Amino acid sequence: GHNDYKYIIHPKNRWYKAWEMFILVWAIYSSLFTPMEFGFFRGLPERLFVLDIVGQIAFLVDIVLQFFVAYRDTQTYRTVYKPTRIAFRYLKSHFLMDFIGCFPWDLIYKASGKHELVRYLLWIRLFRVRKVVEFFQRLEKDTRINYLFTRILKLLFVEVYCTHTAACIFYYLATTLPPENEGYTWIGSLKLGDYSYENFREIDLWKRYTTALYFAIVTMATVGYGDIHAVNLREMIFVMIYVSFDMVLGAYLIGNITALIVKGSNTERFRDKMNDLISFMNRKKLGRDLRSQITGHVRLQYDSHYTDTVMLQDIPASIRAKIAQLLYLPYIKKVPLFKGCSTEFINQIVIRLHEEYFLPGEVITEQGNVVDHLYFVCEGLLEALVTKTDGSEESVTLLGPHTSFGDISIICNISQPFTVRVCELCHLLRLDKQSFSNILEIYFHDGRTILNNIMEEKESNDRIKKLESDIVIHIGKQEAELALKVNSAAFQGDFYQLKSLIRSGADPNKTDYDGRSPLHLAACRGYEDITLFLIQEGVDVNLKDKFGHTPLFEAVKAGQEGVIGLLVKEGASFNLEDSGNFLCTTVAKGDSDFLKRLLSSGMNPNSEDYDHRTPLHVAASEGLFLMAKMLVEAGASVISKDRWGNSPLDEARLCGNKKLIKLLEDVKNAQSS
Amino acid sequence: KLESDIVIHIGKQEAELALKVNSAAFQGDFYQLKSLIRSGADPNKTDYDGRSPLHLAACRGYEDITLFLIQEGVDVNLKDKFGHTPLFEAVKAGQEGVIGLLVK
Amino acid sequence: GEVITEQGNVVDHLYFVCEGLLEALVTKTDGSEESVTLLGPHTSFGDISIICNISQPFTVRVCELCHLLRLDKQSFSNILEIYFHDGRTILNNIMEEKESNDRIK
């Protein structure tokens, strides 16, 4: 709608197309009549005045209409609607010839005392054949008609044109000589049969024109009967020039027709291959069913045109992906192998897919052979069988539309457990082994989180009992690195990054090298929000790292009452080995708050050691009355006997803190009760 | 306006390079560590768990990695956030070859 | 001045050197590709990567006009698997080199 001007008309407008065809008809005529007007008349016979004036005006109108038609640029490929650019383009290329040939050159010739050199400018109207050339340019750029066939008709029109012009020039050369020397011309000395072309300027223009055209036509085919022949030196020279250029034009005609016939139709090439195969097939005397198999598969390769699918490898990746998506993606989405995976990975797979058709009864993949081509059964039923060593087929599965096979062997790098053979017209989508693996490895991430899901699919088959493979190890490496990333986020405080990482498909229950979950890190650095975020995810709250440190242990050692509260509400527990030992060590340190936090978490304070002493034992021996109060509130036994029977009551007397002993005796009556 | 990812991956130029060195050490891929350590960053920087490439390499017991880490000269007595030296990780795993390398 | 195998791409084609001189350059993030060795006539490269199923240790670049004989990875693996004895001999031959590669362990 950028044609704001009310003057410029788009070059593809229907009315302008009709006008283009119409000036074409007049271009052919004004280009085919100009040689006749130049040769057979030294001034039009008045009776043609009307036709001459109407022709001149017809082109004159066109000359103007060429200022009101937009032209597509050769550098921006847009229809330039600026009137000054159209006017400049027309003035520069096709304007001198058009305007000069639009002049009434017949009237100008008559006005200037009938001077011949003025009439020689009639040939400027020969430039009007540029319209015919442009028409052939349009016709060539259309699949509706074969190119070499366009070239043949172009060459034939050129041949007809050159023949007609040569006839007109030949008769004009006859007219250059004065009528007194008629016997020395080519037509003035013509005695064909009983007719004698004595006064050749008085015969009807059609008789003379057909004589000249007969000569030109036979000269063009080099028949040269000899009845009509050059006599003058001017006629000799013209016939020599015409004859040489006619040898070039006819040789080009033969070359173009030969090029069309040796081009080779696609059906022709298929027919040659078919004939060779049939001759082979007669030599080997193959049976009718077997010959039908061979012929049918060759026909299938012919119709499928697999290279036509790779024929658009030149078009951009954007549109290439659009075509692959519009054709294979609906099929691929439904395959159970890629159930529940990212759309990006699916799109990558589709782009790398090559469709192949197979007639019933041909093995696709052979058992005992490592599959290097994963197939997506998309149309037609396939049948999978493990043929026994005794030659007994055992159909194990029937893979209909929207199914996949070969994937086990590629992901496993194992051999194909069952030979797969076709049962109907199976339109499949082959994907190469290196292609698939790449989409996971070479296309890292595209083949990390997504492939993990694919591994979930394979394990959900419930028959696959695979251990590990190159693909799987590569993935596990990537998932390890991703786990490092998400754990770094969970230990750095970057909430947005952690969100993005796990929401990109990362499993929140993964661990790093030393088995530390992101929840471990959130608790250790006391990241309340991150902890709660991972808490929502479902990360294990008593997850055990390399040293058994639970997330709630890390939270307690970090002194994050918010995080420990959250973890106990979810249910994190002190499943720590040597619990009594660590508690007694804490008592020895004197870290009152640390022990209080462990005791609040629910650490059992009655756990013994190698010396078989509870934390309360150590507190009583140490004289730590306040740690003893905390242990008492927890419920550590003050009567528990150690190796030597030294109960915490005894150790307290040994230390001599009478207040400590008194509180422990109140506890001892509590225990005895 | 989801900016500042610059400083995120600078905190990971200190870390993610260090965690990649740690990961290669834990996996056992000597060639990778050699390239990363010389072309990327020294193994003196530890991970978020305060674990030096040497610590994890010592635990795994790949002397190849350790001897290269020894060439870089990372602290052989450095403790982790868990208060544990590479020597202890080595003996915990019982990697007498890497134990001898570390004792040297 | 051409590259056959690039460092870190698993070699799928094992090459021999009939005539010419090659060079094992370790490309890096410094650009100073480390000249590990010069592969002269009657040598081979890509063998470590194929046999050991690792990536290429060093990019092999052409220095002269080199006539190289090629053996695809799948082919080579097939002949090795067929002649288990002979592949064992190959493995010893490369083990002597693996004193610095440590791939065998």
Side-chain angles (χ1 to χ4, degrees):
Chain A
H2 285 86
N3 59 338
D4 309 359
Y5 323 89
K6 222 171 185 178
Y7 327 91
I8 316 303
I9 164 176
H10 194 97
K12 83 200 187 164
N13 172 259
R14 288 295 304 122
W15 295 100
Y16 179 72
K17 249 57 180 61
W19 170 251
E20 203 169 0
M21 186 106 180
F22 177 85
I23 200 58
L24 175 64
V25 182
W26 226 313
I28 299 177
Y29 162 84
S30 176
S31 66
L32 278 181
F33 177 74
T34 280
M36 211 177 305
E37 177 194 1
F38 172 79
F40 298 89
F41 311 92
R42 292 208 162 181
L44 279 187
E46 170 266 358
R47 58 184 300 178
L48 291 181
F49 200 30
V50 202
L51 208 36
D52 175 56
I53 306 173
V54 173
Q56 286 152 0
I57 298 303
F59 290 90
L60 192 58
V61 169
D62 187 61
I63 291 193
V64 175
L65 255 59
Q66 301 278 102
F67 301 103
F68 306 150
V69 277
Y71 69 95
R72 204 201 41 181
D73 224 327
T74 42
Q75 298 176 358
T76 88
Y77 277 33
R78 313 208 53 200
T79 44
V80 158
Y81 280 110
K82 194 71 49 174
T84 206
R85 309 224 91 84
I86 324 164
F88 221 48
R89 182 178 107 125
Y90 191 65
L91 260 55
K92 292 183 104 166
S93 158
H94 323 118
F95 180 77
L96 215 80
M97 302 318 148
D98 291 10
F99 199 35
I100 288 265
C102 265
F103 296 163
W105 279 114
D106 206 76
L107 295 202
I108 294 192
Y109 162 74
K110 305 211 166 118
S112 279
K114 293 214 270 223
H115 186 33
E116 204 37 54
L117 283 311
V118 191
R119 233 166 54 91
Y120 277 76
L121 275 96
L122 257 200
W123 290 97
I124 308 310
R125 316 162 84 117
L126 255 285
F127 283 107
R128 293 173 174 181
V129 86
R130 143 178 61 74
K131 316 264 183 18
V132 193
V133 175
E134 151 66 0
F135 154 84
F136 277 95
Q137 295 178 0
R138 300 179 303 179
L139 192 71
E140 280 169 357
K141 296 309 194 311
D142 195 0
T143 63
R144 296 299 84 240
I145 164 182
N146 195 301
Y147 177 84
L148 303 176
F149 180 86
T150 63
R151 282 314 175 121
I152 288 176
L153 279 316
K154 167 182 299 182
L155 255 294
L156 293 180
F157 172 87
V158 165
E159 281 218 319
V160 159
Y161 212 109
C162 296
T163 289
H164 165 78
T165 57
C168 304
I169 301 193
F170 202 42
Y171 174 83
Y172 172 67
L173 285 197
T175 70
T176 62
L177 268 189
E180 51 156 353
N181 300 343
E182 273 180 328
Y184 198 32
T185 71
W186 67 264
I187 175 158
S189 43
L190 209 62
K191 312 275 154 44
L192 282 195
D194 272 7
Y195 204 74
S196 35
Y197 296 61
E198 269 142 5
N199 282 46
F200 71 92
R201 329 218 185 206
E202 318 287 320
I203 325 174
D204 315 351
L205 87 143
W206 294 121
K207 184 144 223 148
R208 313 173 272 160
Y209 175 65
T210 296
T211 299
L213 194 50
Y214 176 82
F215 173 89
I217 288 272
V218 306
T219 301
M220 194 198 19
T222 81
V223 211
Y225 295 101
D227 58 332
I228 321 197
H229 60 262
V231 154
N232 283 133
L233 250 49
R234 55 176 44 101
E235 284 142 48
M236 270 156 177
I237 287 161
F238 163 72
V239 167
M240 290 164 46
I241 291 164
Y242 179 40
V243 151
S244 320
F245 150 81
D246 161 42
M247 184 182 59
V248 194
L249 206 72
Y252 267 91
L253 182 61
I254 302 179
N256 287 300
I257 299 188
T258 301
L260 178 170
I261 304 264
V262 192
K263 189 62 179 181
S265 301
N266 182 55
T267 173
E268 209 213 298
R269 299 302 190 63
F270 154 81
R271 110 93 49 161
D272 305 302
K273 194 92 181 183
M274 202 85 218
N275 264 357
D276 254 30
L277 271 193
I278 295 179
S279 288
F280 175 86
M281 281 173 37
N282 294 301
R283 307 155 206 174
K284 303 310 178 180
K285 305 261 65 177
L286 300 183
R288 194 161 71 280
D289 46 61
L290 183 54
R291 71 191 26 262
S292 302
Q293 311 323 100
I294 291 125
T295 59
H297 184 87
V298 172
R299 274 201 261 110
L300 201 37
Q301 286 326 59
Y302 173 50
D303 302 304
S304 60
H305 213 307
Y306 20 83
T307 171
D308 211 0
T309 74
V310 86
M311 202 68 58
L312 310 75
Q313 83 294 30
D314 21 52
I315 88 163
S318 325
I319 308 206
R320 252 175 297 179
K322 296 167 192 176
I323 322 188
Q325 280 197 169
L326 188 149
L327 295 176
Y328 320 143
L329 185 73
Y331 284 0
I332 302 311
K333 274 172 52 33
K334 314 191 194 66
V335 201
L337 174 69
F338 308 151
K339 178 61 188 60
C341 328
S342 81
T343 300
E344 302 96 290
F345 156 89
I346 309 179
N347 295 306
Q348 306 293 359
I349 292 293
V350 173
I351 300 168
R352 316 293 232 244
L353 281 175
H354 312 269
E355 51 176 20
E356 320 187 306
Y357 293 62
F358 295 93
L359 273 194
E362 322 146 23
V363 165
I364 284 286
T365 206
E366 299 167 18
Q367 68 199 63
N369 201 7
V370 177
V371 160
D372 284 60
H373 289 328
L374 182 174
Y375 300 64
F376 295 69
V377 200
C378 304
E379 181 145 308
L381 170 67
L382 259 159
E383 149 170 78
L385 339 84
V386 48
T387 165
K388 279 85 76 187
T389 175
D390 89 334
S392 181
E393 92 174 355
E394 181 172 58
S395 178
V396 284
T397 36
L398 268 301
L399 316 102
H402 308 325
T403 315
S404 61
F405 64 89
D407 75 14
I408 310 95
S409 177
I410 330 171
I411 271 162
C412 260
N413 324 282
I414 61 179
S415 325
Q416 173 34 285
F418 48 72
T419 289
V420 152
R421 338 180 301 108
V422 173
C423 286
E424 283 119 64
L425 195 271
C426 288
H427 173 208
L428 313 183
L429 281 293
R430 184 191 32 52
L431 173 66
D432 283 358
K433 154 162 162 93
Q434 293 304 300
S435 304
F436 188 33
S437 305
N438 284 0
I439 304 296
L440 337 169
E441 53 177 58
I442 275 305
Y443 271 29
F444 308 90
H445 312 329
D446 285 301
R448 177 202 53 182
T449 289
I450 296 87
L451 216 280
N452 191 60
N453 281 167
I454 309 285
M455 299 306 342
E456 319 300 355
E457 310 304 298
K458 293 301 320 312
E459 307 319 299
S460 78
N461 195 183
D462 312 302
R463 184 191 40 211
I464 301 305
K465 83 202 161 303
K466 140 178 198 43
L467 290 318
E468 68 189 302
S469 73
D470 231 331
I471 283 300
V472 170
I473 321 315
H474 166 87
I475 318 161
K477 298 173 182 176
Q478 288 210 63
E479 337 193 338
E481 287 227 4
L482 174 62
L484 305 182
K485 304 272 181 323
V486 57
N487 295 3
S488 71
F491 227 179
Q492 221 68 53
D494 208 303
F495 200 26
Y496 143 83
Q497 173 84 100
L498 162 87
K499 286 177 168 175
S500 64
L501 291 164
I502 89 173
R503 294 164 193 239
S504 297
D507 169 59
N509 286 242
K510 290 296 181 179
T511 36
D512 40 25
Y513 359 80
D514 60 304
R516 278 255 282 178
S517 64
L519 182 43
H520 272 149
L521 308 194
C524 182
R525 214 71 61 101
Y527 290 147
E528 310 306 302
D529 58 65
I530 291 186
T531 300
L532 197 55
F533 172 82
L534 303 175
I535 260 184
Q536 271 88 67
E537 300 317 298
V539 194
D540 185 5
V541 296
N542 33 52
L543 181 296
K544 312 289 293 167
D545 61 1
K546 204 43 62 163
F547 342 90
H549 301 153
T550 60
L552 157 82
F553 173 110
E554 295 298 300
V556 169
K557 82 188 301 180
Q560 317 288 356
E561 280 105 330
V563 160
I564 39 167
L566 301 167
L567 295 180
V568 201
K569 155 212 71 173
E570 271 196 349
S573 67
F574 274 31
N575 314 87
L576 281 293
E577 32 182 346
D578 247 14
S579 61
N581 154 87
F582 155 42
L583 280 177
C584 296
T585 308
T586 304
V587 166
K589 304 331 300 163
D591 205 359
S592 60
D593 42 299
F594 204 111
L595 178 78
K596 164 261 304 172
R597 294 186 309 241
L598 329 178
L599 273 193
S600 302
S601 305
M603 205 134 181
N604 224 317
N606 297 247
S607 303
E608 97 163 12
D609 310 0
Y610 36 59
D611 78 17
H612 304 335
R613 293 184 70 242
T614 71
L616 196 39
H617 283 57
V618 196
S621 55
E622 280 283 301
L624 304 173
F625 186 22
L626 70 173
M627 328 317 150
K629 334 192 291 183
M630 321 192 248
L631 296 167
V632 152
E633 275 95 64
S637 174
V638 192
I639 72 181
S640 48
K641 308 306 181 302
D642 65 3
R643 289 176 164 295
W644 322 259
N646 288 59
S647 79
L649 286 159
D650 316 359
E651 299 284 359
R653 318 163 319 180
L654 302 179
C655 87
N657 204 55
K658 304 282 142 283
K659 40 176 58 181
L660 167 61
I661 314 166
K662 164 272 171 163
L663 196 156
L664 302 180
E665 320 145 32
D666 273 28
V667 185
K668 86 202 172 313
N669 331 92
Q671 298 186 244
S672 68
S673 63
Chain B
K1 324 93 184 66
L2 285 311
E3 301 145 290
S4 170
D5 288 57
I6 314 201
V7 193
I8 303 179
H9 89 87
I10 211 172
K12 292 176 300 175
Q13 281 191 2
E14 317 135 23
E16 138 171 31
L17 270 61
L19 299 81
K20 290 179 180 187
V21 171
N22 297 2
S23 180
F26 164 41
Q27 291 164 359
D29 174 3
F30 188 30
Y31 198 30
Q32 177 69 0
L33 283 125
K34 305 174 61 61
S35 162
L36 290 182
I37 295 175
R38 299 167 302 183
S39 169
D42 55 357
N44 299 301
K45 309 176 181 179
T46 66
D47 51 57
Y48 40 73
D49 286 356
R51 293 205 147 243
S52 75
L54 186 50
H55 280 97
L56 297 176
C59 167
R60 267 293 203 177
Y62 304 98
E63 323 170 3
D64 320 358
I65 307 176
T66 295
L67 65 88
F68 188 87
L69 298 168
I70 292 320
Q71 292 294 65
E72 317 312 299
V74 189
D75 190 3
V76 191
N77 294 347
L78 166 40
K79 303 176 343 187
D80 298 306
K81 184 272 291 193
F82 320 98
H84 268 301
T85 50
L87 171 83
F88 177 94
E89 281 325 290
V91 48
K92 184 93 171 303
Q95 316 280 359
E96 300 88 2
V98 110
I99 291 172
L101 191 43
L102 267 204
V103 162
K104 156 44 191 183
Chain C
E2 278 72 10
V3 172
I4 308 105
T5 75
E6 173 300 299
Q7 183 178 359
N9 303 4
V10 67
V11 154
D12 326 293
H13 318 342
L14 180 159
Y15 293 87
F16 311 93
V17 189
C18 293
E19 297 190 356
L21 181 64
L22 299 157
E23 190 171 2
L25 293 85
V26 166
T27 313
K28 50 198 63 172
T29 323
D30 198 4
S32 54
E33 303 157 358
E34 166 189 359
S35 179
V36 171
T37 177
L38 297 172
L39 305 310
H42 309 247
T43 58
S44 67
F45 61 93
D47 91 3
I48 285 97
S49 176
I50 290 176
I51 298 194
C52 265
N53 155 256
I54 61 163
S55 64
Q56 174 67 2
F58 23 75
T59 292
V60 152
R61 154 143 52 117
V62 186
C63 183
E64 321 294 9
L65 271 193
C66 322
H67 169 211
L68 305 193
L69 295 178
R70 204 271 290 290
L71 179 62
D72 174 315
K73 175 291 191 183
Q74 187 58 60
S75 309
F76 186 35
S77 34
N78 264 356
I79 314 103
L80 291 153
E81 295 163 0
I82 288 295
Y83 307 92
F84 4 90
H85 314 192
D86 261 301
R88 159 79 269 123
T89 306
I90 307 304
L91 227 64
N92 300 303
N93 300 357
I94 40 154
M95 142 189 304
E96 310 315 280
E97 333 171 5
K98 259 62 177 197
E99 80 187 0
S100 305
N101 298 299
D102 203 339
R103 305 287 80 120
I104 314 303
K105 304 304 154 295

